[model samples]
Target: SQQTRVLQEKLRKLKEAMLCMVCCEEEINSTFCPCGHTVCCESCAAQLQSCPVCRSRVEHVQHVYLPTHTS
Candidate 1:
């Protein structure tokens, strides 16, 4: 079942992509401030005062990798 194989592979890749919600240009490069929801890239996120997804109060960010799973 190639269709089945393709779907499974597609899902596997998506589980590990975890790109930024704001830019979608690169991988999710940073976590949101304060609430610590990882949803934006480092560059685009720097211009924001709050998280795009949760609207939480913005604060300084610590470097982090976005949520992802390996195959």
Candidate 2:
């Protein structure tokens, strides 16, 4: 039972963290910058060539955080 309990706890924490990050919210439906700051969606990110938070140019981008769903 301990293993099951631990798994459940982990799942709960994961869900909570995801909810706090608003992973399902419209403001961050998809699209993340190399700096880790995420945009609301692909369309919103396409308008910018850099991360608005850090002002790092697009050329410096190393990765993007895509949302789990499309708006």
Candidate 3:
């Protein structure tokens, strides 16, 4: 139960962080990509091949935005 609680806590934090600060959307719930500059939600990121914020090419175009623990 303790381990489960810890894991849940970590997951909750991760969920919060994975959410795009700009769009306030979850990575998994969206179909977005990182423009190699910053993380974005799928729809917002898809509008341009390059990052909207920095104009950088999206990394692994095929790989949509997936929530990660690390930046």
Candidate 4:
């Protein structure tokens, strides 16, 4: 019984950690650069000016947002 409880606890924590560090799940407040693969937020995007993923030069950044809540 004690071992089962411990395993379950570890799994729950693991599941939480497995999700995205940003917003988690399939949905997230994501931004895209011209090169297309950087996870930089506003400040990061402005400072980096280059896609961390492909190391491509960034000409522009596109931010994808959503309403706080949807009925």
lDDT per prediction? Answer: 0.72, 0.52, 0.56, 0.56
Q: Which of the numbered candidates is closest to the native, going by highest lDDT?
A: 1
Models 1 onward score TM values of: 0.68, 0.39, 0.39, 0.45
Model 2 TM-score (2 dp): 0.39
Query: Cα deviation of 50 in candidate 4 (Å)?
Result: 1.6
* Tens-digit lDDT track of model 4 for 1-71: 99999999998776554333343443323455556663544555555555666778887777655463122
Residue 47 miss distance in model 1 (angstroms): 0.8
- Candidate 3 positional error at 52, Å: 8.7
What TM-score quantifies how close candidate 3 is to the native fold? 0.39
lDDT of 1 by residue, 1-71 (tens): 99999999998678446766666666676777678887666797888887787888788766674345222
- Winner on lDDT between 2 and 4 is 4
User: For residue 23, what is the lDDT in candidate 3?
Assistant: 71
Local accuracy of candidate 2 as per-residue lDDT tens digits, 1-71: 89999999998766454331323433344344456665444455566677666677654333344464333
Q: Say which prediction, candidate 1 or candidate 4, comes out ahead on TM-score.
A: 1
Listed per candidate, the RMSD to the true structure in angstroms reads 3.8, 6.2, 6.5, 6.5
lDDT of 3 by residue, 1-71 (tens): 89999999998887776666557664633422443444555555555566555655656444443444344
Off by over 4 Å in 3: 28-35, 43-71
The local distance difference test score of model 1 is 0.72
